[PDB]
mmCIF file of C-alpha atoms and ligand atoms in Angstrom:
data_model
loop_
_atom_site.group_PDB
_atom_site.id
_atom_site.type_symbol
_atom_site.label_atom_id
_atom_site.label_comp_id
_atom_site.label_asym_id
_atom_site.label_seq_id
_atom_site.Cartn_x
_atom_site.Cartn_y
_atom_site.Cartn_z
ATOM 1 C CA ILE A 1 -0.334 0.190 -0.060
ATOM 2 C CA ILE A 2 1.475 3.442 -1.276
ATOM 3 C CA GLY A 3 0.532 6.218 0.822
ATOM 4 C CA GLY A 4 -1.641 4.804 3.280
ATOM 5 C CA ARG A 5 -1.894 4.238 6.870
ATOM 6 C CA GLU A 6 -1.241 1.609 9.384
ATOM 7 C CA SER A 7 -4.664 -0.441 9.796
ATOM 8 C CA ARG A 8 -6.168 -0.636 13.246
ATOM 9 C CA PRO A 9 -5.355 -4.145 14.221
ATOM 10 C CA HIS A 10 -7.758 -6.702 13.260
ATOM 11 C CA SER A 11 -9.854 -4.075 12.104
ATOM 12 C CA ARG A 12 -10.516 -6.107 8.550
ATOM 13 C CA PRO A 13 -10.715 -9.689 10.005
ATOM 14 C CA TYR A 14 -11.279 -11.120 6.698
ATOM 15 C CA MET A 15 -7.381 -10.285 5.792
ATOM 16 C CA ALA A 16 -5.712 -13.678 4.691
ATOM 17 C CA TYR A 17 -2.141 -13.247 3.906
ATOM 18 C CA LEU A 18 -0.935 -16.201 1.475
ATOM 19 C CA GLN A 19 2.768 -17.181 1.170
ATOM 20 C CA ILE A 20 3.108 -19.320 -2.177
ATOM 21 C CA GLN A 21 5.728 -21.981 -3.203
ATOM 22 C CA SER A 22 6.922 -23.087 0.409
ATOM 23 C CA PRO A 23 10.272 -21.312 0.453
ATOM 24 C CA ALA A 24 10.329 -18.778 2.853
ATOM 25 C CA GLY A 25 9.975 -15.411 0.757
ATOM 26 C CA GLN A 26 9.487 -17.254 -2.331
ATOM 27 C CA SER A 27 6.255 -15.011 -3.342
ATOM 28 C CA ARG A 28 3.895 -12.996 -1.062
ATOM 29 C CA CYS A 29 -0.172 -11.894 -1.868
ATOM 30 C CA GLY A 30 -3.327 -10.791 0.102
ATOM 31 C CA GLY A 31 -6.442 -12.398 -0.357
ATOM 32 C CA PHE A 32 -9.784 -12.434 1.780
ATOM 33 C CA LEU A 33 -12.220 -14.999 3.656
ATOM 34 C CA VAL A 34 -15.623 -15.350 1.464
ATOM 35 C CA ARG A 35 -16.609 -18.508 3.711
ATOM 36 C CA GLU A 36 -14.946 -20.534 6.461
ATOM 37 C CA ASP A 37 -13.348 -22.574 3.924
ATOM 38 C CA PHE A 38 -12.449 -20.467 1.102
ATOM 39 C CA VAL A 39 -10.274 -17.124 0.429
ATOM 40 C CA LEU A 40 -10.741 -15.327 -2.552
ATOM 41 C CA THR A 41 -7.437 -13.663 -4.366
ATOM 42 C CA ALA A 42 -6.059 -13.087 -7.649
ATOM 43 C CA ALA A 43 -5.190 -16.018 -10.004
ATOM 44 C CA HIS A 44 -1.436 -14.707 -11.101
ATOM 45 C CA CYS A 45 -0.592 -15.542 -7.196
ATOM 46 C CA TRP A 46 -1.359 -19.555 -8.280
ATOM 47 C CA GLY A 47 1.530 -21.502 -7.258
ATOM 48 C CA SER A 48 1.509 -25.329 -5.815
ATOM 49 C CA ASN A 49 1.943 -25.040 -2.561
ATOM 50 C CA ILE A 50 0.057 -21.836 -0.914
ATOM 51 C CA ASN A 51 0.067 -21.238 3.141
ATOM 52 C CA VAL A 52 -2.443 -18.945 4.404
ATOM 53 C CA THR A 53 -2.645 -17.111 7.994
ATOM 54 C CA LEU A 54 -5.900 -15.339 8.973
ATOM 55 C CA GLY A 55 -6.194 -13.555 12.050
ATOM 56 C CA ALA A 56 -2.783 -11.319 11.785
ATOM 57 C CA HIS A 57 -1.856 -7.891 11.893
ATOM 58 C CA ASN A 58 1.950 -8.705 11.722
ATOM 59 C CA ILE A 59 2.737 -11.391 9.914
ATOM 60 C CA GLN A 60 6.252 -11.446 10.799
ATOM 61 C CA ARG A 61 5.422 -12.838 13.862
ATOM 62 C CA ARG A 62 2.983 -15.620 15.302
ATOM 63 C CA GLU A 63 0.276 -14.006 17.150
ATOM 64 C CA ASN A 64 -2.099 -15.714 19.303
ATOM 65 C CA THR A 65 -4.943 -14.557 17.080
ATOM 66 C CA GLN A 66 -3.360 -15.925 13.682
ATOM 67 C CA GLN A 67 -4.986 -19.210 12.212
ATOM 68 C CA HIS A 68 -2.350 -21.298 9.508
ATOM 69 C CA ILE A 69 -4.387 -22.967 7.149
ATOM 70 C CA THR A 70 -2.450 -24.688 3.720
ATOM 71 C CA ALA A 71 -4.944 -24.427 0.515
ATOM 72 C CA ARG A 72 -6.160 -27.469 -0.392
ATOM 73 C CA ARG A 73 -6.998 -26.627 -3.877
ATOM 74 C CA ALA A 74 -5.825 -23.170 -5.268
ATOM 75 C CA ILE A 75 -8.574 -22.826 -8.276
ATOM 76 C CA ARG A 76 -8.115 -20.505 -10.888
ATOM 77 C CA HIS A 77 -10.441 -19.124 -13.198
ATOM 78 C CA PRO A 78 -10.897 -21.289 -16.296
ATOM 79 C CA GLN A 79 -10.596 -18.223 -18.046
ATOM 80 C CA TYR A 80 -7.600 -16.808 -16.669
ATOM 81 C CA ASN A 81 -4.998 -15.446 -19.119
ATOM 82 C CA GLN A 82 -1.432 -14.589 -17.396
ATOM 83 C CA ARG A 83 -0.546 -12.881 -20.570
ATOM 84 C CA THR A 84 -3.062 -10.182 -20.842
ATOM 85 C CA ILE A 85 -3.879 -10.365 -17.071
ATOM 86 C CA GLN A 86 -7.371 -11.600 -17.591
ATOM 87 C CA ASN A 87 -9.784 -12.784 -15.101
ATOM 88 C CA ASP A 88 -7.173 -12.505 -12.701
ATOM 89 C CA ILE A 89 -9.463 -14.553 -9.946
ATOM 90 C CA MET A 90 -8.664 -17.183 -7.744
ATOM 91 C CA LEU A 91 -10.507 -19.187 -5.097
ATOM 92 C CA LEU A 92 -8.366 -21.541 -2.140
ATOM 93 C CA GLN A 93 -10.171 -23.948 -0.157
ATOM 94 C CA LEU A 94 -8.726 -24.332 2.467
ATOM 95 C CA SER A 95 -7.299 -27.584 4.132
ATOM 96 C CA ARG A 96 -9.515 -27.075 7.130
ATOM 97 C CA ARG A 97 -12.182 -24.731 8.284
ATOM 98 C CA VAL A 98 -11.453 -21.686 9.877
ATOM 99 C CA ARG A 99 -12.408 -21.297 13.912
ATOM 100 C CA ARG A 100 -15.030 -18.227 13.389
ATOM 101 C CA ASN A 101 -14.229 -15.622 15.683
ATOM 102 C CA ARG A 102 -13.791 -11.553 16.269
ATOM 103 C CA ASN A 103 -10.271 -11.356 14.439
ATOM 104 C CA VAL A 104 -11.131 -14.204 11.942
ATOM 105 C CA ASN A 105 -14.615 -14.065 10.065
ATOM 106 C CA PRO A 106 -15.372 -13.728 6.113
ATOM 107 C CA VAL A 107 -16.272 -10.259 4.457
ATOM 108 C CA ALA A 108 -19.730 -9.585 2.440
ATOM 109 C CA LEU A 109 -19.313 -9.907 -0.955
ATOM 110 C CA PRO A 110 -21.264 -7.479 -3.930
ATOM 111 C CA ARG A 111 -24.405 -8.955 -5.446
ATOM 112 C CA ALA A 112 -23.746 -10.217 -9.146
ATOM 113 C CA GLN A 113 -23.053 -7.570 -11.404
ATOM 114 C CA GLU A 114 -23.063 -4.893 -9.306
ATOM 115 C CA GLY A 115 -21.076 -1.825 -10.560
ATOM 116 C CA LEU A 116 -19.381 1.118 -9.568
ATOM 117 C CA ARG A 117 -19.635 4.680 -10.010
ATOM 118 C CA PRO A 118 -16.544 7.080 -10.969
ATOM 119 C CA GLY A 119 -15.702 9.007 -7.781
ATOM 120 C CA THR A 120 -16.587 6.498 -5.332
ATOM 121 C CA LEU A 121 -14.122 6.491 -2.389
ATOM 122 C CA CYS A 122 -13.256 2.686 -1.655
ATOM 123 C CA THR A 123 -10.386 1.373 0.747
ATOM 124 C CA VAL A 124 -7.645 -1.435 -0.212
ATOM 125 C CA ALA A 125 -5.848 -3.474 2.728
ATOM 126 C CA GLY A 126 -2.644 -5.275 2.444
ATOM 127 C CA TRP A 127 1.480 -6.078 3.255
ATOM 128 C CA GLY A 128 2.480 -5.322 0.047
ATOM 129 C CA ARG A 129 5.332 -2.452 -0.665
ATOM 130 C CA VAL A 130 4.767 0.972 0.177
ATOM 131 C CA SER A 131 7.667 2.404 -2.156
ATOM 132 C CA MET A 132 9.670 0.655 -4.606
ATOM 133 C CA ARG A 133 12.482 0.298 -1.304
ATOM 134 C CA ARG A 134 10.576 -0.402 1.277
ATOM 135 C CA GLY A 135 8.302 -3.146 2.480
ATOM 136 C CA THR A 136 5.610 -3.631 5.302
ATOM 137 C CA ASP A 137 5.279 -6.142 8.434
ATOM 138 C CA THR A 138 2.187 -4.982 9.174
ATOM 139 C CA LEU A 139 -1.608 -4.635 7.786
ATOM 140 C CA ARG A 140 -1.928 -0.683 5.809
ATOM 141 C CA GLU A 141 -4.831 0.426 3.795
ATOM 142 C CA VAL A 142 -5.541 3.524 1.724
ATOM 143 C CA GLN A 143 -8.712 4.996 0.314
ATOM 144 C CA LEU A 144 -8.378 5.445 -3.363
ATOM 145 C CA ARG A 145 -11.127 6.705 -5.911
ATOM 146 C CA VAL A 146 -12.812 4.578 -8.607
ATOM 147 C CA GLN A 147 -11.684 6.115 -12.266
ATOM 148 C CA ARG A 148 -14.012 6.235 -15.463
ATOM 149 C CA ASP A 149 -13.279 3.258 -17.335
ATOM 150 C CA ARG A 150 -11.640 5.454 -20.240
ATOM 151 C CA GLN A 151 -8.321 6.157 -18.326
ATOM 152 C CA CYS A 152 -7.907 2.650 -17.548
ATOM 153 C CA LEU A 153 -8.905 1.482 -21.540
ATOM 154 C CA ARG A 154 -5.868 3.992 -22.430
ATOM 155 C CA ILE A 155 -3.676 2.592 -20.323
ATOM 156 C CA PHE A 156 -4.071 -0.723 -20.267
ATOM 157 C CA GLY A 157 -4.647 -3.051 -23.103
ATOM 158 C CA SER A 158 -7.048 -5.745 -22.514
ATOM 159 C CA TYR A 159 -9.329 -3.913 -20.042
ATOM 160 C CA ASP A 160 -12.998 -4.572 -19.668
ATOM 161 C CA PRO A 161 -14.725 -2.471 -17.633
ATOM 162 C CA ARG A 162 -17.484 -5.798 -16.780
ATOM 163 C CA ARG A 163 -15.168 -7.473 -15.418
ATOM 164 C CA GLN A 164 -12.451 -5.064 -14.113
ATOM 165 C CA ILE A 165 -12.097 -1.970 -11.988
ATOM 166 C CA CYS A 166 -10.219 1.336 -12.925
ATOM 167 C CA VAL A 167 -9.173 2.475 -9.432
ATOM 168 C CA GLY A 168 -6.837 5.621 -8.189
ATOM 169 C CA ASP A 169 -6.485 9.177 -8.931
ATOM 170 C CA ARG A 170 -3.373 10.100 -10.660
ATOM 171 C CA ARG A 171 -3.563 13.152 -8.861
ATOM 172 C CA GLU A 172 -2.446 11.692 -5.669
ATOM 173 C CA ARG A 173 0.062 8.668 -4.464
ATOM 174 C CA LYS A 174 -2.096 6.571 -2.943
ATOM 175 C CA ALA A 175 -2.788 2.995 -4.710
ATOM 176 C CA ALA A 176 -2.260 -0.430 -4.144
ATOM 177 C CA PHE A 177 0.987 -1.779 -5.289
ATOM 178 C CA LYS A 178 2.955 -4.846 -5.309
ATOM 179 C CA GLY A 179 2.288 -7.669 -2.751
ATOM 180 C CA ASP A 180 -0.837 -6.453 -1.860
ATOM 181 C CA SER A 181 -2.253 -8.252 -5.278
ATOM 182 C CA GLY A 182 -5.261 -10.716 -4.080
ATOM 183 C CA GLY A 183 -6.108 -8.297 -1.357
ATOM 184 C CA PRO A 184 -9.852 -6.563 -1.010
ATOM 185 C CA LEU A 185 -10.885 -3.318 -2.479
ATOM 186 C CA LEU A 186 -13.985 -2.161 -0.112
ATOM 187 C CA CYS A 187 -16.915 -0.074 -1.558
ATOM 188 C CA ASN A 188 -19.350 0.934 1.293
ATOM 189 C CA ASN A 189 -17.788 -2.088 3.082
ATOM 190 C CA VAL A 190 -18.744 -4.770 0.761
ATOM 191 C CA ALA A 191 -15.477 -6.327 -1.263
ATOM 192 C CA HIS A 192 -15.816 -5.194 -4.909
ATOM 193 C CA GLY A 193 -12.709 -5.493 -6.043
ATOM 194 C CA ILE A 194 -9.097 -8.061 -6.067
ATOM 195 C CA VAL A 195 -6.047 -6.080 -6.622
ATOM 196 C CA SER A 196 -4.596 -7.734 -9.876
ATOM 197 C CA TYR A 197 -2.275 -4.856 -11.524
ATOM 198 C CA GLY A 198 -1.549 -1.517 -12.341
ATOM 199 C CA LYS A 199 2.392 0.681 -13.854
ATOM 200 C CA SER A 200 5.644 -0.878 -11.856
ATOM 201 C CA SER A 201 5.826 2.453 -10.695
ATOM 202 C CA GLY A 202 2.762 2.154 -8.826
ATOM 203 C CA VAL A 203 1.412 5.633 -9.987
ATOM 204 C CA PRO A 204 -2.876 4.971 -10.382
ATOM 205 C CA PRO A 205 -4.710 4.688 -12.150
ATOM 206 C CA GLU A 206 -4.387 0.803 -11.464
ATOM 207 C CA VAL A 207 -6.674 -2.319 -12.383
ATOM 208 C CA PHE A 208 -8.695 -4.621 -9.757
ATOM 209 C CA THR A 209 -10.743 -7.979 -10.927
ATOM 210 C CA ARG A 210 -14.332 -6.884 -10.403
ATOM 211 C CA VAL A 211 -15.697 -9.554 -8.229
ATOM 212 C CA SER A 212 -19.332 -8.823 -9.057
ATOM 213 C CA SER A 213 -19.002 -10.447 -12.627
ATOM 214 C CA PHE A 214 -17.503 -14.136 -11.009
ATOM 215 C CA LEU A 215 -20.727 -14.476 -8.637
ATOM 216 C CA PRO A 216 -22.007 -17.496 -10.860
ATOM 217 C CA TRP A 217 -17.986 -19.239 -10.697
ATOM 218 C CA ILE A 218 -17.363 -18.180 -7.279
ATOM 219 C CA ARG A 219 -20.984 -19.660 -6.039
ATOM 220 C CA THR A 220 -20.434 -23.292 -8.452
ATOM 221 C CA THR A 221 -17.098 -23.654 -7.193
ATOM 222 C CA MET A 222 -18.208 -23.296 -3.136
ATOM 223 C CA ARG A 223 -21.163 -25.475 -3.957
ATOM 224 C CA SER A 224 -19.151 -28.113 -3.832
HETATM 225 C C1 OHH B 301 6.743 -5.028 -11.606
HETATM 226 N N1 OHH B 301 5.245 -5.175 -11.063
HETATM 227 C C2 OHH B 301 4.915 -4.322 -10.067
HETATM 228 O O1 OHH B 301 6.087 -4.293 -9.235
HETATM 229 C C3 OHH B 301 3.677 -4.624 -9.625
HETATM 230 C C4 OHH B 301 2.864 -3.475 -9.294
HETATM 231 C C5 OHH B 301 1.272 -2.907 -9.155
HETATM 232 C C6 OHH B 301 0.796 -1.733 -8.939
HETATM 233 C C7 OHH B 301 -0.243 -1.576 -8.775
HETATM 234 C C8 OHH B 301 -1.622 -3.163 -8.071
HETATM 235 C C9 OHH B 301 -0.374 -4.201 -8.258
HETATM 236 C C10 OHH B 301 0.759 -4.532 -8.317
HETATM 237 C C11 OHH B 301 1.515 -5.804 -8.731
HETATM 238 C C12 OHH B 301 3.247 -5.728 -9.105
HETATM 239 C C13 OHH B 301 3.509 -7.090 -9.069
HETATM 240 O O2 OHH B 301 4.651 -7.153 -8.636
HETATM 241 C C14 OHH B 301 2.928 -8.281 -9.044
HETATM 242 C C15 OHH B 301 3.190 -9.549 -10.018
HETATM 243 C C16 OHH B 301 4.769 -10.568 -10.378
HETATM 244 C C17 OHH B 301 4.992 -11.420 -11.304
HETATM 245 C C18 OHH B 301 3.773 -11.435 -12.286
HETATM 246 C C19 OHH B 301 2.570 -10.820 -12.301
HETATM 247 C C20 OHH B 301 1.482 -10.632 -13.821
HETATM 248 C C21 OHH B 301 0.474 -10.264 -13.610
HETATM 249 C C22 OHH B 301 -0.565 -9.534 -12.663
HETATM 250 C C23 OHH B 301 0.599 -9.194 -11.487
HETATM 251 C C24 OHH B 301 2.516 -9.656 -10.721
HETATM 252 P P1 OHH B 301 2.572 -9.475 -7.359
HETATM 253 O O3 OHH B 301 2.533 -8.118 -6.405
HETATM 254 O O4 OHH B 301 1.772 -10.478 -7.176
HETATM 255 O O5 OHH B 301 4.135 -9.818 -6.425
HETATM 256 C C25 OHH B 301 4.146 -5.407 -12.406
HETATM 257 C C26 OHH B 301 3.566 -4.631 -13.368
HETATM 258 C C27 OHH B 301 2.307 -4.780 -13.856
HETATM 259 N N2 OHH B 301 2.813 -5.948 -14.677
HETATM 260 C C28 OHH B 301 2.537 -6.050 -15.982
HETATM 261 O O6 OHH B 301 2.761 -7.313 -16.707
HETATM 262 C C29 OHH B 301 2.235 -5.312 -16.846
HETATM 263 C C30 OHH B 301 0.855 -5.473 -18.172
HETATM 264 C C31 OHH B 301 0.585 -4.025 -18.577
HETATM 265 C C32 OHH B 301 0.805 -2.822 -19.198
HETATM 266 C C33 OHH B 301 0.338 -1.755 -19.664
HETATM 267 C C34 OHH B 301 0.835 -0.370 -19.164
HETATM 268 C C35 OHH B 301 1.989 -0.214 -18.136
HETATM 269 C C36 OHH B 301 2.443 -1.310 -17.269
HETATM 270 C C37 OHH B 301 2.043 -2.554 -17.861
HETATM 271 C C38 OHH B 301 2.342 -3.726 -16.835
HETATM 272 C C39 OHH B 301 3.320 -7.143 -13.972
HETATM 273 C C40 OHH B 301 4.593 -6.664 -12.967
#
């Protein structure tokens, strides 16, 4: 998170920290609990081995509030295209159900096809980098304004306004960044987006996956 603030501890109990590929420090991503047995995140974060940490604030400490679970299944969206980064969404079925409590619980999702008006203020959270040189051990968050789709349609090649969201006013140094991938974009406290990608500089507008266009698939995949 660039230009944000440290989050009040445990104020976003749905936050999940992902470590992809056993090797400690091999790859980091964010995600969010949607049910006691499922975590939603980005498909470009896929790996053969994913360790999930729920209930954390400082992910570099084995906190009493944490619950550690491995991804039993890492289900990439069937039409995920890593080259164009389209359909960047993935469901992680946890090896075991979390014990739901004040520090670990699901987040509300948008209804099917729910959109977002440009100018709306949303919040994204994560343990990603705060700059090219600095990262963070603790959860941070920042408020960003939804942008008109035309901006991302000009900047990013394959953008689809139905399946993606254009976020971040270029006039402010605030945005989700490297390591925040997979994390949620909360608009009116509902998880409308998943951090997908943006410029390597971190200067917005940036692209989020629009959760509301994938409800049928999410439903089906979870209706196991
Ligand atoms: C150097 N970068 C970044 O520092 C970066 C910037 C971001 C800016 C805003 C929001 C999220 C961001 C995530 C990252 C990453 O490095 C991700 C990461 C690692 C490896 C492969 C990935 C494949 C798809 C999505 C995330 C990926 P990571 O977070 O998973 O580690 C990323 C910039 C975006 N990328 C592009 O090809 C890309 C595509 C079209 C573009 C069009 C215009 C300008 C830049 C463009 C850059 C990938 C690497």
